[PDB]
Amino acid sequence: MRELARLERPEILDQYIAGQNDWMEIDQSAVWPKLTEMQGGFCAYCECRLNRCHIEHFRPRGKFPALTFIWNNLFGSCGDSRKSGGWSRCGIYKDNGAGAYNADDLIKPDEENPDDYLLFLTTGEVVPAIGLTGRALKKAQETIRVFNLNGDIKLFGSRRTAVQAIMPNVEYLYTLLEEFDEDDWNEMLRDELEKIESDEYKTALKHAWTFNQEFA
Amino acid sequence: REFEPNDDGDQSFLDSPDMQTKGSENAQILEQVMNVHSTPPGIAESHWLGNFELLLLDNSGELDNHSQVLYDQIKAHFGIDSIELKKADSLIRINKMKNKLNKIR
Amino acid sequence: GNLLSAFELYQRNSVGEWFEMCRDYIQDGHVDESGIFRPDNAFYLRRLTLKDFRRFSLLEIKLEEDLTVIIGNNGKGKTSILYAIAKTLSWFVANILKEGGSGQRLSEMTDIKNDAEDRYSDVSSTFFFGKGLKSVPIRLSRSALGTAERRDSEVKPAKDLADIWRVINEVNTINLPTFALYNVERSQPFNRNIKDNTGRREERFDAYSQTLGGAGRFDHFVEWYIYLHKRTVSDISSSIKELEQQVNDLQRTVDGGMVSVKSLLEQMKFKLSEAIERNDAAVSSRVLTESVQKSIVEKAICSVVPSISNIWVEMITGSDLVKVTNDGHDVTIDQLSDGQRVFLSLVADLARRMVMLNPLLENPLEGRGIVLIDEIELHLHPKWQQEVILNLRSAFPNIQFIITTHSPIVLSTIEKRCIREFEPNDDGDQSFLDSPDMQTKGSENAQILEQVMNVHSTPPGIAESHWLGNFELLLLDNSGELDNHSQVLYDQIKAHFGIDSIELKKADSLIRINKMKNKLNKIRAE
Amino acid sequence: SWFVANILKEGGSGQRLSEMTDIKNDAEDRYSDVSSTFFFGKGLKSVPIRLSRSALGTAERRDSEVKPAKDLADIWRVINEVNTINLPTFALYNVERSQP
Ligand SMILES: [Zn+2]
Numbered sequence: 025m026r027e028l029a030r031l032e033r034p035e036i037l038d039q040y041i042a043g044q045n046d047w048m049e050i051d052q053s054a055v056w057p058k059l060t061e062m063q064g065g066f067c068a069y070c071e072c073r074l075n076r077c078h079i080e081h082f083r084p085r086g087k088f089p090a091l092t093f094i095w096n097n098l099f100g101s102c103g104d105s106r107k108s109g110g111w112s113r114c115g116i117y118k119d120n121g122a123g124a125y126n127a128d129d130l131i132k133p134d135e136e137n138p139d140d141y142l143l144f145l146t147t148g149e150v151v152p153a154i155g156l157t158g159r160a161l162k163k164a165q166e167t168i169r170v171f172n173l174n175g176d177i178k179l180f181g182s183r184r185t186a187v188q189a190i191m192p193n194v195e196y197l198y199t200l201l202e203e204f205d206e207d208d209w210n211e212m213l214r215d216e217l218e219k220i221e222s223d224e225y226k227t228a229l230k231h232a233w234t235f236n237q238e239f240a
Numbered sequence: 241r242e243f244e245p246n247d248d249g250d251q252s253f254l255d256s257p258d259m260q261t262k263g264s265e266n267a268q269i270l271e272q273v274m275n276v277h278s279t280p281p282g283i284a285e286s287h288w289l290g291n292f293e294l295l296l297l298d299n300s301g302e303l304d305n306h307s308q309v310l311y312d313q314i315k316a317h318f319g320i321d322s323i324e325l326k327k328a329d330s331l332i333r334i335n336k337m338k339n340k341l342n343k344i345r
Numbered sequence: 346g347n348l349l350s351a352f353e354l355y356q357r358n359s360v361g362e363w364f365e366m367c368r369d370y371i372q373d374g375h376v377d378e379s380g381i382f383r384p385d386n387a388f389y390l391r392r393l394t395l396k397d398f399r400r401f402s403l404l405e406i407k408l409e410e411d412l413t414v415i416i417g418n419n420g421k422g423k424t425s426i427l428y429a430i431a432k433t434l435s436w437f438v439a440n441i442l443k444e445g446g447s448g449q450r451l452s453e454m455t456d457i458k459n460d461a462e463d464r465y466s467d468v469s470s471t472f473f474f475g476k477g478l479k480s481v482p483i484r485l486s487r488s489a490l491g492t493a494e495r496r497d498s499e500v501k502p503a504k505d506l507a508d509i510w511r512v513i514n515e516v517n518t519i520n521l522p523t524f525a526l527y528n529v530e531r532s533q534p535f536n537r538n539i540k541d542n543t544g545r546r547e548e549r550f551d552a553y554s555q556t557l558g559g560a561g562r563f564d565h566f567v568e569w570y571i572y573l574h575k576r577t578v579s580d581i582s583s584s585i586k587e588l589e590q591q592v593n594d595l596q597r598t599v600d601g602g603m604v605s606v607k608s609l610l611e612q613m614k615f616k617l618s619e620a621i622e623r624n625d626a627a628v629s630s631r632v633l634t635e636s637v638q639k640s641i642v643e644k645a646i647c648s649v650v651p652s653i654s655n656i657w658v659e660m661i662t663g664s665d666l667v668k669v670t671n672d673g674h675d676v677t678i679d680q681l682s683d684g685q686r687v688f689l690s691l692v693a694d695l696a697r698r699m700v701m702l703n704p705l706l707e708n709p710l711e712g713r714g715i716v717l718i719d720e721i722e723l724h725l726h727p728k729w730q731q732e733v734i735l736n737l738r739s740a741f742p743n744i745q746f747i748i749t750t751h752s753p754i755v756l757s758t759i760e761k762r763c764i765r766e767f768e769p770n771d772d773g774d775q776s777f778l779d780s781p782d783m784q785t786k787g788s789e790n791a792q793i794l795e796q797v798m799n800v801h802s803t804p805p806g807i808a809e810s811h812w813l814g815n816f817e818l819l820l821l822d823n824s825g826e827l828d829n830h831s832q833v834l835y836d837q838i839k840a841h842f843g844i845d846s847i848e849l850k851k852a853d854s855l856i857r858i859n860k861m862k863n864k865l866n867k868i869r870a871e
Numbered sequence: 872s873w874f875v876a877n878i879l880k881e882g883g884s885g886q887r888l889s890e891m892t893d894i895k896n897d898a899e900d901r902y903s904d905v906s907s908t909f910f911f912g913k914g915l916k917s918v919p920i921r922l923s924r925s926a927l928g929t930a931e932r933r934d935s936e937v938k939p940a941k942d943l944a945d946i947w948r949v950i951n952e953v954n955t956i957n958l959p960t961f962a963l964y965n966v967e968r969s970q971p
Contacts, residue, residue: 073845109244110244110245110246110247112245145290145293145294146293146331147289147290147293149290151294154297154298177271177275177276177277178271178272181271181272181278185847186850189847189850189851189854190854191330192854192858193854193857193858193862194334195330195333195334196858196862197862198334198337198338198341199333199334199337200866201337201341203866203870212862215861224845235338235341235342236342236345238345240345259846260841260842260843260846262807262809262841263803263804263807263809263810264803264842265802265803265847266790266791266794266802266803267789267790267791267802268847270727270790274727276727276728276731278789278790278791279757279787279788279789279790280731280757280758280787282731282732282735283758283786283787285786285787286787317784318784319783319784322783322784323789323792530971532969533970674896674897675896676896679892680892683966
């Protein structure tokens with residue numbers, strides 16, 4: 025989960041009145057231009073490329089119908105129901121598989137930083153960060169369960185394989201710091217992190233290369 | 241042609257899979273189209289490398305009596321030429337250099 | 346102490362001390378910290394040897410106390426070993442049932458090696474029965490017709506042990522061992538017309554019937570199971586007090602002294618006494634009530650088979666039938682698929698015999714014995730092959746198993762000490778069976794196919810399989826720098842496998858390491 | 872089975888569905904149907920067939936529809952009796968192939 029940022033609303037959100045208009049009355053072709061500029065073509069939760077997709081109300085329509093047209097309540101998400109299927113992660117599983125869930129117990133990617141809660145292991149598993157305590161701990165635990173982030177075998181196998189392919193490259197560098205100058209060895213690292221903004225599952229790739237929240 | 245992940249008998253029409261099967265690796269097919277893990281999740285010794293990586297990171301990348309004792313179990317069970325032991329050695333090295341570079345910073 | 350000395354002093358001399366010592370050595374044991382019963386004296390087979398048999402000159406094998414597995418691609422070689430063990434066990438079964446008796450024997454026109462100048466053949470074995478009786482040897486033999494001399498068998502040490510079990514049990518009841526064989530011939534269709542009826546499937550010693558035949562008797566299980574229903578549904582002790590009516594109250598009105606009518610009274614009074622004699626005789630052993638016998642079998646069947654959650658008997662218009670719940674819906678036995686029926690046909694047959702043979706235990710499935718199975722995976726999809734071994738070994742804690750397979754998924758679940766590798770020389774023969782180098786328990790499947798079975802992970806007969814390897818040679822020759830010959834391969838890989846696939850992710854990594862980090866370091870250092 | 876029987880004799884007959892097992896255990900209507908469509912070149916683009924059966928003790932029966940298959944089998948048999956031609960092959964291999 026990368027850190028998202030929200031910009032100005034699309035005017036068409038001002039054209040409809042909550043409880044008077046059904047959400048089916050919006051032209052959805054008008055709003056994808058703004059959800060794309062910010063997300064860059066990837067799923068908001070599981071970080072993979074989008075080929076079949078839909079727009080998700082973060083706080084549900086059923087329970088809270090007053091939020092049906094609030095610009096801060098929308099995100100772009102993977103999978104579909106018009107093309108049918110047994111899909112089992114992200115926003116479909118949040119309704120049909122999670123069971124019960126408190127909306128205030130979940131991390132939101134544009135008002136908190138997930139780096140305060142989550143760690144990625146080189147084996148491909150996701151775990152709560154080192155040294156946490158009860159209130160932070162329950163946020164990390166429910167966020168991992170409700171979105172099924174360790175339980176879809178297709179997601180687990182793909183992420184594991186993506187990290188395991190880079191390791192021979194990671195050990196070649198990090199072992200020449202006695203041959204290079206103190207600034208040249210920094211440049212020899214920036215040329216790696218500059219590519220990773222364009223690939224899949226970036227967060228896991230960042231946790232292999234880095235050494236601190238301080239960049240170099 | 242294949243069935244959906246769950247079905248009571250009420251699916252109306254069948255479909256083909258996503259990935260290309262012709263000449264692909266055996267261990268990818270079993271996980272991507274048949275939904276089965278690469279090693280058996282019910283066997284206790286299959287989980288040890290995940291515990292070793294987490295236990296080394298907790299003490300800031302330094303070995304201790306606990307992590308030394310765990311490293312000796314892996315070596316004695318899988319043996320001296322094993323992939324498991326060759327993989328565990330790489331984690332120790334790159335983590336040592338990562339700690340040295342921080343201390344210089 | 347010495348069990349044969351105690352039995353000698355008892356027999357002769359006719360004693361209570363010598364009898365009591367014989368019964369305690371068989372019955373003592375204790376409860377483990379996990380709540381499992383373990384007997385003080387174990388019983389198992391230790392070694393086998395074959396001479397001039399069928400295609401083998403001289404061969405020896407060592408067996409594990411818990412589990413042994415045989416592997417290799419020759420089918421007739423592996424099958425001939427299980428045939429030789431099953432001949433030997435028949436001599437114990439014959440002597441438990443009746444005094445004297447006889448087992449099976451070798452065949453002069455099939456079993457002797459075709460060109461051995463000795464013109465005879467032998468099979469030899471050795472068992473163990475705890476610290477007081479640590480060795481029991483046996484030999485079976487035969488020779489060609491028209492020779493100067495003759496070879497006989499040697500079996501007295503085996504007869505002696507079976508007599509102790511038979512003699513003590515007639516004075517005061519004990520538990521007894523189990524022996525069985527399941528072959529490839531177990532997969533056959535099921536006949537729905539169970540019209541046949543007979544009065545013999547209700548005796549402690551029908552448990553040894555057909556037991557080494559190779560397929561089991563699933564038709565006998567269905568007759569036995571519905572009989573427990575009709576007697577538990579309404580208490581049969583009512584029939585005694587019902588027959589007591591005419592027997593006690595015709596007496597006072599059988600007037601005129603007529604032989605015909607008073608014979609009708611004599612017949613009902615006779616019949617009632619011969620009926621009650623069975624209710625008296627049943628008290629002479631700790632036979633479990635039919636309500637408890639029915640309850641134990643249903644928990645075992647439902648715990649081991651993955652898809653079945655309930656089973657019961659019910660009455661239709663004119664006969665009883667068996668029903669099950671399978672995948673959450675209710676069906677008859679003739680509507681199950683072949684992979685489901687064949688695996689249930691195994692578990693039900695083994696569960697009945699153990700509840701009949703061990704009446705004095707708290708949990709009858711904790712007894713002792715030996716079991717042989719042939720192809721272990723048959724009609725089973727990959728997900729069940731990861732867990733079939735753990736389910737059986739959890740349900741039957743004290744039995745010894747011997748099995749055969751060629752699936753790599755099953756081998757990921759066992760320790761390397763249990764494995765025996767079979768690899769004949771030309772025209773047959775070996776002297777010994779070996780074990781592999783690598784550890785199998787908890788290892789990844791792609792290594793087992795390569796190192797234990799010598800087969801590659803990608804089909805060698807398909808042209809598209811090779812060309813990721815050809816790209817690496819083209820990138821190396823011109824020293825890690827691209828050219829048109831590399832570009833045409835890069836486009837063909839991307840066209841066939843697609844953009845996000847692992848082949849293209851792996852190919853991009855070669856360029857990105859072998860260009861910049863290699864070239865810049867060497868050029869700068871220069 | 873309805874093609875093979877009509878190549879060998881005029882006015883043949885095929886196999887049937889079972890009363891006792893093949894109908895779904897909890898369906899309300901208590902009858903069942905199976906339907907197919909074959910092709911034989913740009914001069915004969917479509918050939919339909921339907922097999923059906925109704926449960927025991929029901930008041931009214933479903934009916935099968937098999938005429939289009941008889942009409943195509945007759946042209947293969949009749950033309951062959953005047954002069955020689957090549958003919959189609961049909962076969963099934965089951966799990967019982969393994970039995971001794
Ligand atoms: Zn997603």
